[PDB]
Coordinates of C-alpha atoms and ligand atoms in Angstrom, one line a residue:
Chain A
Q1 CA 69.2 123.3 -54.4
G2 CA 72.5 121.5 -53.8
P3 CA 76.1 122.1 -52.9
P4 CA 77.4 125.7 -53.1
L5 CA 78.4 127.5 -56.3
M6 CA 75.8 125.9 -58.5
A7 CA 75.0 129.5 -59.5
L8 CA 78.3 129.6 -61.4
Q9 CA 77.2 126.8 -63.8
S10 CA 75.9 127.2 -67.3
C11 CA 72.4 126.3 -68.6
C12 CA 70.8 125.6 -72.0
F13 CA 67.8 127.5 -73.5
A14 CA 67.9 125.9 -76.9
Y15 CA 68.7 122.5 -78.3
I16 CA 70.4 121.6 -81.6
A17 CA 67.9 120.5 -84.2
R18 CA 69.7 117.6 -85.8
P19 CA 72.3 115.0 -84.6
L20 CA 75.9 116.2 -84.7
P21 CA 78.4 114.0 -86.6
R22 CA 79.2 111.3 -84.1
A23 CA 82.8 111.5 -85.3
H24 CA 83.1 115.1 -84.1
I25 CA 82.0 114.5 -80.4
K26 CA 84.5 114.1 -77.6
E27 CA 82.7 114.2 -74.3
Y28 CA 79.4 115.0 -72.7
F29 CA 78.0 116.4 -69.5
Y30 CA 74.5 117.2 -68.0
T31 CA 73.7 120.8 -67.1
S32 CA 73.2 121.6 -63.4
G33 CA 70.0 120.8 -61.5
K34 CA 69.8 124.6 -60.9
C35 CA 68.9 125.0 -64.6
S36 CA 65.4 125.6 -65.7
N37 CA 65.8 123.1 -68.5
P38 CA 67.2 119.6 -68.5
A39 CA 70.0 119.4 -71.1
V40 CA 72.9 117.4 -72.4
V41 CA 76.0 119.3 -73.5
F42 CA 78.3 117.8 -76.1
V43 CA 81.8 119.0 -76.5
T44 CA 83.6 118.6 -79.8
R45 CA 87.1 117.9 -81.0
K46 CA 87.2 121.7 -81.6
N47 CA 85.9 122.1 -78.0
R48 CA 82.6 123.8 -79.0
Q49 CA 79.8 123.2 -76.6
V50 CA 76.3 122.4 -77.9
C51 CA 73.1 121.9 -76.0
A52 CA 71.0 118.9 -76.9
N53 CA 67.7 117.4 -75.8
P54 CA 68.1 114.5 -73.4
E55 CA 64.7 113.1 -74.5
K56 CA 65.8 112.6 -78.1
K57 CA 66.8 109.0 -79.1
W58 CA 69.9 110.1 -80.9
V59 CA 71.2 112.0 -77.8
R60 CA 70.7 109.0 -75.5
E61 CA 72.4 106.7 -78.1
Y62 CA 75.3 109.2 -78.3
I63 CA 75.6 109.1 -74.5
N64 CA 75.6 105.3 -74.4
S65 CA 78.3 105.3 -77.0
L66 CA 80.6 107.6 -75.1
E67 CA 80.5 105.2 -72.1
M68 CA 81.8 102.1 -73.9
Chain B
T1 CA 74.0 128.7 -81.9
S2 CA 72.6 126.4 -79.2
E3 CA 75.5 127.1 -76.9
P4 CA 75.2 127.0 -73.1
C5 CA 74.5 130.4 -71.5
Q6 CA 77.6 131.9 -70.1
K7 CA 78.0 133.5 -66.7
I8 CA 81.6 134.2 -67.5
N9 CA 81.8 137.5 -65.5
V10 CA 80.0 136.2 -62.4
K11 CA 82.3 133.2 -62.3
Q12 CA 85.5 135.2 -62.6
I13 CA 84.4 137.7 -60.1
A14 CA 83.4 135.0 -57.6
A15 CA 86.8 133.3 -58.1
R16 CA 88.5 136.4 -56.7
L17 CA 86.0 137.5 -54.0
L18 CA 84.9 134.2 -52.4
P19 CA 88.2 132.5 -51.4
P20 CA 89.4 135.2 -49.1
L21 CA 85.9 135.8 -47.7
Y22 CA 85.3 132.1 -47.0
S23 CA 88.8 131.9 -45.5
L24 CA 87.9 134.8 -43.1
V25 CA 84.7 133.0 -42.3
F26 CA 86.6 129.7 -41.6
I27 CA 89.1 131.7 -39.4
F28 CA 86.6 133.5 -37.3
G29 CA 84.1 130.7 -37.3
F30 CA 86.5 128.0 -36.2
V31 CA 88.0 129.9 -33.3
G32 CA 84.6 131.3 -32.4
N33 CA 82.8 127.9 -32.1
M34 CA 85.8 126.2 -30.6
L35 CA 85.7 128.8 -27.9
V36 CA 81.9 128.4 -27.4
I37 CA 82.4 124.6 -27.1
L38 CA 85.3 125.1 -24.7
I39 CA 83.2 127.5 -22.5
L40 CA 80.1 125.3 -22.5
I41 CA 82.0 122.2 -21.5
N42 CA 84.6 123.5 -19.1
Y43 CA 83.2 126.8 -17.7
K44 CA 79.4 126.5 -17.8
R45 CA 79.8 122.7 -17.6
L46 CA 76.5 121.7 -19.3
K47 CA 73.9 121.5 -16.5
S48 CA 70.7 122.1 -18.5
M49 CA 68.8 121.3 -21.7
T50 CA 69.8 124.7 -23.1
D51 CA 73.5 124.2 -22.7
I52 CA 73.1 120.9 -24.5
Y53 CA 71.4 122.5 -27.5
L54 CA 73.9 125.3 -27.6
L55 CA 76.6 122.7 -27.7
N56 CA 75.0 120.8 -30.5
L57 CA 74.4 124.1 -32.3
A58 CA 78.1 124.9 -32.2
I59 CA 78.9 121.4 -33.4
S60 CA 76.5 122.0 -36.3
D61 CA 78.4 125.1 -37.3
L62 CA 81.7 123.1 -37.2
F63 CA 80.4 120.5 -39.7
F64 CA 79.6 123.4 -41.9
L65 CA 83.0 125.1 -41.3
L66 CA 85.0 122.0 -42.1
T67 CA 83.6 122.1 -45.7
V68 CA 84.3 125.8 -46.2
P69 CA 88.0 125.6 -47.2
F70 CA 87.0 123.2 -50.0
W71 CA 84.2 125.4 -51.4
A72 CA 86.8 128.2 -51.1
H73 CA 89.2 126.3 -53.3
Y74 CA 86.4 125.2 -55.7
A75 CA 85.7 128.9 -56.3
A76 CA 89.4 129.6 -56.7
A77 CA 90.0 126.8 -59.2
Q78 CA 87.7 123.9 -59.8
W79 CA 86.7 120.7 -58.1
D80 CA 90.0 119.0 -57.6
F81 CA 88.9 116.6 -54.9
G82 CA 87.2 113.9 -56.8
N83 CA 83.7 112.5 -56.6
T84 CA 83.6 110.7 -53.3
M85 CA 85.0 113.8 -51.6
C86 CA 82.3 115.8 -53.5
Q87 CA 79.5 113.6 -52.1
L88 CA 81.0 113.6 -48.6
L89 CA 81.4 117.3 -48.3
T90 CA 78.0 118.0 -49.7
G91 CA 76.7 115.7 -47.0
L92 CA 78.5 117.5 -44.2
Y93 CA 77.3 120.8 -45.6
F94 CA 73.6 119.8 -45.5
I95 CA 73.9 118.0 -42.2
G96 CA 75.4 121.2 -40.8
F97 CA 72.6 123.1 -42.4
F98 CA 69.6 121.2 -41.3
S99 CA 70.9 120.4 -37.8
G100 CA 71.6 124.1 -37.5
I101 CA 68.1 125.2 -37.9
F102 CA 66.7 122.2 -36.0
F103 CA 68.7 123.1 -32.8
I104 CA 67.7 126.8 -33.1
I105 CA 64.1 125.5 -33.2
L106 CA 64.8 123.2 -30.2
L107 CA 66.3 126.2 -28.4
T108 CA 63.2 128.2 -29.1
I109 CA 60.9 125.5 -27.9
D110 CA 63.0 124.7 -24.8
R111 CA 62.8 128.3 -23.7
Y112 CA 59.1 128.4 -24.6
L113 CA 58.4 125.5 -22.4
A114 CA 60.3 127.1 -19.6
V115 CA 58.4 130.4 -19.8
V116 CA 54.8 129.2 -20.7
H117 CA 54.5 125.7 -19.2
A118 CA 56.8 126.0 -16.2
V119 CA 55.3 123.0 -14.3
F120 CA 55.4 120.6 -17.3
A121 CA 58.9 121.6 -18.1
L122 CA 60.1 120.2 -14.7
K123 CA 60.5 116.5 -15.8
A124 CA 60.6 117.3 -19.5
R125 CA 63.6 119.5 -19.5
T126 CA 65.9 116.8 -17.9
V127 CA 69.4 116.9 -19.4
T128 CA 68.8 113.2 -20.1
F129 CA 66.0 114.0 -22.5
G130 CA 68.0 116.9 -23.9
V131 CA 70.6 114.3 -25.0
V132 CA 68.2 111.8 -26.5
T133 CA 66.4 114.6 -28.3
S134 CA 69.8 115.8 -29.7
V135 CA 70.6 112.2 -30.9
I136 CA 67.3 111.8 -32.7
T137 CA 67.8 115.3 -34.2
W138 CA 71.2 114.4 -35.7
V139 CA 69.7 111.2 -37.2
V140 CA 66.9 113.2 -38.8
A141 CA 69.3 115.9 -40.1
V142 CA 71.2 113.1 -41.8
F143 CA 68.1 111.5 -43.4
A144 CA 67.1 115.0 -44.6
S145 CA 70.5 115.3 -46.2
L146 CA 70.6 112.0 -48.0
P147 CA 68.9 113.0 -51.2
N148 CA 71.2 115.9 -51.6
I149 CA 74.2 113.6 -51.3
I150 CA 72.9 111.1 -53.9
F151 CA 71.9 113.7 -56.4
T152 CA 75.4 115.3 -56.2
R153 CA 78.4 114.3 -58.3
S154 CA 81.6 115.7 -59.6
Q155 CA 81.9 115.8 -63.4
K156 CA 84.2 117.2 -66.1
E157 CA 82.3 120.0 -67.8
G158 CA 84.6 120.7 -70.8
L159 CA 87.7 122.4 -69.4
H160 CA 86.5 122.7 -65.8
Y161 CA 85.6 120.1 -63.1
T162 CA 82.5 120.8 -61.0
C163 CA 80.7 119.5 -58.0
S164 CA 77.0 119.9 -58.5
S165 CA 73.5 118.3 -58.1
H166 CA 71.8 116.8 -61.1
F167 CA 68.2 115.6 -61.3
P168 CA 67.0 112.8 -63.6
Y169 CA 65.7 114.5 -66.7
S170 CA 62.6 112.3 -66.9
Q171 CA 61.3 113.7 -63.6
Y172 CA 63.3 117.0 -63.7
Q173 CA 60.9 119.6 -62.4
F174 CA 59.5 117.1 -59.8
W175 CA 62.9 116.7 -58.2
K176 CA 63.7 120.4 -58.4
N177 CA 60.5 121.2 -56.6
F178 CA 61.0 118.4 -54.1
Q179 CA 64.5 119.5 -53.2
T180 CA 63.7 123.2 -53.1
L181 CA 60.6 122.7 -51.0
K182 CA 62.5 120.5 -48.6
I183 CA 65.0 123.3 -48.0
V184 CA 62.4 126.0 -47.8
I185 CA 59.9 124.3 -45.7
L186 CA 62.5 123.0 -43.2
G187 CA 64.7 126.0 -43.4
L188 CA 62.2 128.8 -43.5
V189 CA 58.5 127.9 -43.1
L190 CA 59.0 125.5 -40.2
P191 CA 61.1 127.8 -38.0
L192 CA 58.8 130.8 -38.9
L193 CA 55.9 128.8 -37.7
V194 CA 57.7 127.8 -34.5
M195 CA 58.7 131.4 -34.0
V196 CA 55.2 132.8 -34.5
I197 CA 53.6 130.2 -32.2
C198 CA 56.2 130.3 -29.5
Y199 CA 56.7 134.0 -29.4
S200 CA 53.0 134.8 -29.0
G201 CA 52.9 132.4 -26.1
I202 CA 56.0 134.1 -24.6
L203 CA 55.3 137.8 -25.2
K204 CA 51.9 137.1 -23.5
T205 CA 53.6 135.8 -20.4
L206 CA 56.4 138.4 -20.6
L207 CA 54.3 141.6 -20.3
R208 CA 52.4 140.4 -17.3
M209 CA 53.0 142.5 -14.1
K210 CA 56.6 142.3 -13.0
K211 CA 57.8 141.7 -9.4
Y212 CA 60.2 144.1 -7.9
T213 CA 62.6 143.9 -4.9
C214 CA 64.2 146.5 -2.6
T215 CA 68.0 146.7 -3.1
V216 CA 68.6 147.8 0.5
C217 CA 66.4 145.4 2.6
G218 CA 65.3 142.9 0.0
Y219 CA 61.5 143.3 0.4
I220 CA 59.7 142.0 -2.6
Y221 CA 56.8 143.9 -4.1
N222 CA 54.4 141.3 -5.5
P223 CA 52.1 143.1 -8.0
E224 CA 49.5 140.4 -7.5
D225 CA 48.7 141.4 -3.9
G226 CA 50.2 145.0 -3.8
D227 CA 50.6 146.5 -0.4
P228 CA 47.3 147.2 1.5
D229 CA 48.4 148.7 4.8
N230 CA 50.2 151.4 2.9
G231 CA 47.5 152.3 0.4
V232 CA 48.5 150.2 -2.6
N233 CA 45.6 148.4 -4.2
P234 CA 46.4 144.8 -5.2
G235 CA 47.0 144.2 -8.9
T236 CA 48.8 147.5 -9.3
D237 CA 51.8 147.6 -11.6
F238 CA 54.8 148.9 -9.7
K239 CA 54.8 151.8 -12.2
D240 CA 51.2 152.5 -11.2
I241 CA 52.2 153.0 -7.6
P242 CA 52.2 156.6 -6.3
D243 CA 55.8 157.9 -6.4
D244 CA 55.7 159.1 -2.7
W245 CA 55.4 155.5 -1.7
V246 CA 58.5 153.8 0.0
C247 CA 59.7 150.3 1.0
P248 CA 57.4 149.2 3.8
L249 CA 60.4 147.7 5.6
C250 CA 63.2 150.3 5.2
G251 CA 61.5 153.3 3.6
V252 CA 63.6 153.8 0.5
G253 CA 62.1 155.3 -2.6
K254 CA 61.0 153.3 -5.7
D255 CA 64.4 154.6 -7.1
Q256 CA 66.1 151.9 -5.1
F257 CA 64.0 149.0 -6.4
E258 CA 65.0 146.5 -9.1
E259 CA 63.4 143.6 -11.0
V260 CA 63.6 140.2 -9.2
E261 CA 66.4 137.9 -10.5
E262 CA 64.1 135.3 -12.0
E263 CA 62.4 138.0 -14.1
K264 CA 65.6 139.6 -15.5
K265 CA 67.1 136.2 -16.2
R266 CA 64.0 135.4 -18.1
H267 CA 64.3 138.6 -20.1
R268 CA 67.9 137.8 -20.9
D269 CA 67.2 134.2 -21.9
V270 CA 64.4 135.4 -24.2
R271 CA 66.6 138.1 -25.7
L272 CA 69.2 135.5 -26.6
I273 CA 67.0 133.0 -28.3
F274 CA 65.2 135.7 -30.2
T275 CA 68.3 137.3 -31.6
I276 CA 69.7 133.9 -32.7
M277 CA 66.5 133.0 -34.5
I278 CA 66.0 136.3 -36.3
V279 CA 69.7 136.8 -37.1
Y280 CA 69.3 133.3 -38.7
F281 CA 66.4 134.7 -40.9
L282 CA 68.6 137.7 -41.8
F283 CA 71.3 135.5 -43.2
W284 CA 69.3 132.7 -44.7
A285 CA 65.9 133.9 -45.8
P286 CA 67.3 135.7 -48.8
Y287 CA 68.8 132.5 -50.1
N288 CA 65.6 130.5 -49.6
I289 CA 63.6 133.2 -51.4
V290 CA 66.0 133.3 -54.4
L291 CA 65.9 129.5 -54.4
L292 CA 62.1 129.7 -54.9
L293 CA 62.5 132.3 -57.7
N294 CA 65.1 130.1 -59.5
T295 CA 63.1 126.8 -59.2
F296 CA 60.0 128.5 -60.7
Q297 CA 61.9 130.9 -63.0
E298 CA 59.7 129.7 -65.9
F299 CA 56.7 130.7 -63.8
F300 CA 58.1 134.3 -63.4
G301 CA 59.3 134.3 -66.9
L302 CA 62.9 134.5 -65.8
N303 CA 64.1 131.5 -67.8
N304 CA 66.2 133.1 -70.5
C305 CA 70.0 133.7 -70.6
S306 CA 70.0 137.4 -69.5
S307 CA 67.4 137.1 -66.8
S308 CA 68.8 133.9 -65.3
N309 CA 72.2 135.4 -65.2
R310 CA 70.9 138.2 -63.0
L311 CA 69.1 135.5 -61.0
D312 CA 72.4 133.6 -60.7
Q313 CA 74.2 136.7 -59.4
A314 CA 71.5 137.1 -56.7
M315 CA 71.7 133.4 -55.9
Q316 CA 75.4 133.4 -55.4
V317 CA 75.3 136.5 -53.3
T318 CA 72.6 135.2 -51.0
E319 CA 74.1 131.7 -50.8
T320 CA 77.4 133.3 -49.8
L321 CA 75.7 135.4 -47.1
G322 CA 74.2 132.2 -45.8
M323 CA 77.6 130.7 -45.8
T324 CA 79.1 133.4 -43.6
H325 CA 76.4 132.7 -41.0
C326 CA 78.4 129.7 -39.5
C327 CA 80.6 132.3 -37.8
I328 CA 77.9 134.6 -36.6
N329 CA 76.5 132.8 -33.5
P330 CA 79.6 133.1 -31.3
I331 CA 79.7 136.8 -32.2
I332 CA 76.0 137.0 -31.1
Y333 CA 77.0 135.5 -27.7
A334 CA 79.7 138.1 -27.3
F335 CA 77.5 141.1 -27.7
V336 CA 74.2 139.8 -26.4
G337 CA 75.0 137.2 -23.7
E338 CA 76.3 138.5 -20.4
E339 CA 77.2 134.9 -19.4
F340 CA 79.6 134.5 -22.4
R341 CA 81.4 137.9 -22.2
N342 CA 82.2 137.3 -18.6
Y343 CA 83.3 133.7 -19.0
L344 CA 85.4 135.0 -21.9
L345 CA 87.0 137.4 -19.5
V346 CA 87.8 134.6 -17.1
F347 CA 89.2 132.7 -20.0
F348 CA 91.8 135.4 -20.5
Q349 CA 92.4 135.8 -16.8
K350 CA 93.2 132.1 -16.8
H351 CA 95.8 132.8 -19.5
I352 CA 97.5 135.1 -16.9
Ligands
OLC401 C1 77.9 140.4 -45.3 C2 78.8 139.1 -45.6 C3 79.0 138.9 -47.1 C4 77.7 139.2 -47.8 C5 77.8 138.6 -49.2 C6 79.1 139.0 -49.9 C7 79.0 138.6 -51.4 C8 80.4 138.7 -52.0 C9 80.7 138.1 -53.2 C10 79.7 137.3 -54.0 C11 80.3 136.8 -55.2 C12 79.3 136.6 -56.3 C13 79.6 137.5 -57.5 C14 78.4 138.4 -57.7 C15 78.5 138.9 -59.1 C16 77.7 140.2 -59.3 C17 78.5 141.1 -60.1 O1 79.6 141.4 -59.8 O2 78.0 141.7 -61.3 C18 78.7 141.3 -62.5 C19 79.4 142.4 -63.2 O3 78.4 143.4 -63.5 C20 80.0 141.9 -64.5 O4 80.9 142.9 -65.0
OLC402 C1 89.6 121.4 -41.5 C2 90.2 120.8 -42.8 C3 90.7 121.9 -43.7 C4 91.0 121.4 -45.1 C5 91.8 122.4 -45.8 C6 91.8 122.1 -47.3 O1 91.0 121.2 -47.7 O2 92.7 122.7 -48.2 C7 92.3 122.6 -49.6 C8 93.5 123.0 -50.5 O3 93.3 124.4 -50.9 C9 93.6 122.1 -51.7 O4 94.5 122.6 -52.6
OLC403 C1 94.8 129.3 -41.5 C2 94.4 129.0 -42.9 C3 92.9 128.9 -43.0 C4 92.5 128.1 -44.2 C5 92.4 128.9 -45.4 C6 92.2 128.0 -46.6 O1 92.3 126.8 -46.5 O2 92.0 128.5 -47.9 C7 91.8 127.6 -48.9 C8 92.6 128.0 -50.1 O3 92.9 129.4 -50.0 C9 91.9 127.7 -51.4 O4 92.8 127.7 -52.5
OLC404 C1 59.6 118.0 -47.0 C2 59.6 117.4 -48.4 C3 58.8 118.4 -49.3 C4 58.3 117.6 -50.5 C5 57.7 118.5 -51.6 C6 57.2 117.7 -52.7 C7 56.9 118.6 -53.9 C8 56.2 117.8 -55.0 C9 55.9 118.5 -56.2 O1 55.4 119.7 -56.2 O2 56.2 118.0 -57.5 C10 55.8 118.7 -58.6 C11 55.0 117.8 -59.5 O3 54.6 116.7 -58.8 C12 55.8 117.4 -60.7 O4 55.1 116.6 -61.6
OLC405 C1 63.8 138.8 -42.4 C2 64.1 139.4 -43.8 C3 64.6 138.4 -44.7 C4 65.1 139.1 -46.0 C5 63.9 139.6 -46.8 C6 64.0 140.0 -48.1 C7 65.3 140.0 -48.8 C8 65.2 139.1 -50.0 C9 66.1 139.6 -51.1 C10 65.7 138.8 -52.3 C11 66.6 139.2 -53.5 C12 65.8 139.1 -54.8 C13 66.8 138.9 -55.9 C14 66.1 139.3 -57.2 O1 64.9 139.5 -57.3 O2 66.9 139.5 -58.4 C15 66.6 138.5 -59.4 C16 65.9 139.2 -60.6 O3 64.6 138.7 -60.6 C17 66.6 138.8 -61.9 O4 65.9 139.2 -63.0
OLC406 C1 69.0 141.0 -45.6 C2 68.9 141.6 -47.0 C3 70.1 141.1 -47.8 C4 69.6 140.9 -49.2 C5 70.7 140.6 -50.2 C6 70.2 140.4 -51.6 C7 71.2 140.9 -52.6 C8 71.1 140.0 -53.8 C9 71.0 140.8 -55.1 O1 70.0 141.4 -55.3 O2 72.1 141.0 -56.0 C10 71.7 140.7 -57.3 C11 72.4 141.7 -58.3 O3 71.8 141.5 -59.6 C12 73.9 141.4 -58.3 O4 74.6 141.9 -57.2
OLA407 C1 78.0 140.9 -37.9 C2 76.7 141.1 -38.2 C3 75.6 140.6 -37.3 C4 76.0 140.7 -35.9 C5 74.7 140.9 -35.0 C6 75.1 141.6 -33.8 C7 74.1 141.2 -32.7 C8 72.9 142.0 -32.7 C9 73.0 143.3 -32.0 C10 72.1 143.3 -30.8 O1 70.9 142.7 -30.9 O2 72.4 143.8 -29.7
ZN408 ZN1 63.7 148.0 1.8

């Protein structure tokens, strides 16, 4: 329910259990509103993409860090 | 492990198929609606509430069309236009969308009033009121589109740039439902409800006994009061008249009788508005339905990688179908409306 081509976007169905090394994280993005689950996706220096739970304290702290 | 779920095929296929398709849509749609607008302004000249709504409806398709080349590029590459252009175009798209269905509904009601409440429709179907109604309708279409604009942003998603809606994760399923229901109620339920109500009032009036006129002398057979001095009992349908009966004035057979102008014009005006409304449901009801399935995919147990990918294929196909609709209404006028096809012929004669 939004602009076209949201169907082409990826979604998360699992979240990583423990915090990733803050050192290894480059960027972040939120998955589309089309997705069944809310989710944060971290991308690494090695450009892996890992789904994380936006409700977790470490995830929101990680997000805050990447802004500054 | 814990990686996003890929629709890698769906994306790559879409990137090849959609850009030429949308281009074709933008081609046909632009010249089609420009033509419609040119004919309504310069050849039919806007003399009624109907012409006004048809005008606004074509304008609605153009708002939609202006965004199509950008979605076409987005599919072909990524979102290269930056965030403000993302919010703007999303806005135009939903304004086009809602205003589209709102004027189809207003067309339906405008014709309903003309057929069912003819007397009330005298002062109510003033072109003046057509205009103020259109203005209010555009305002409303805009407010209906505001949340979609604010929820939508461009963002870098790893390698690719996107233009997408996001809902605050704290009230995630609330907003998804709100947005989905807003589209489905306004885009599907509401016009279905209007269609149902209005078309029961109209079919009622339409299959009442029809008046016929002699093509030779112009005598009118009024079914209400038949024709007594020639043996025809009042309230007799023209079909229910003995075949050996002739025109009381000139004596031609029933073979030389036609329906009165006001009755055939009414049949034509109902055929037009009906076709528009249901062709709309042909092109857009699939998307709304798939939108409901996606929003409640957990309810149907479709919320896993494999299932949601099939869901996503369906979503993109039906969204795309809906997208092509912004070129369909002029085509409808060309195959259904006698008024358009003739004025189109004069359009080409004026070229010579
Ligand atoms: C009538 C007017 C047009 C009507 C709509 C036309 C839809 C055209 C393209 C949709 C593009 C979306 C791509 C759909 C992907 C489905 C698919 O191709 O399946 C994946 C394949 O199996 C993996 O190898
Ligand atoms: C009507 C305006 C049409 C705009 C066309 C357009 O935006 O072209 C995008 C281009 O593909 C970007 O590389
Ligand atoms: C006449 C050209 C009609 C516009 C076609 C168009 O703008 O397509 C966008 C472009 O192909 C996307 O990369
Ligand atoms: C027209 C607007 C339609 C508004 C539809 C609002 C739907 C509200 C809803 O169902 O939200 C789910 C629940 O409240 C989440 O906690
Ligand atoms: C007036 C008539 C309006 C059209 C009526 C029905 C067409 C709706 C077609 C809906 C397409 C369903 C897509 C689907 O079910 O596939 C997803 C699947 O669940 C993945 O596992
Ligand atoms: C009007 C009926 C049109 C209904 C069109 C619905 C087709 C969508 C669909 O079912 O396609 C999904 C499939 O998994 C991939 O092509
Ligand atoms: C193109 C596909 C849809 C075109 C619809 C054609 C108008 C309907 C035909 C008719 O009712 O006479
Ligand atoms: Zn006669």
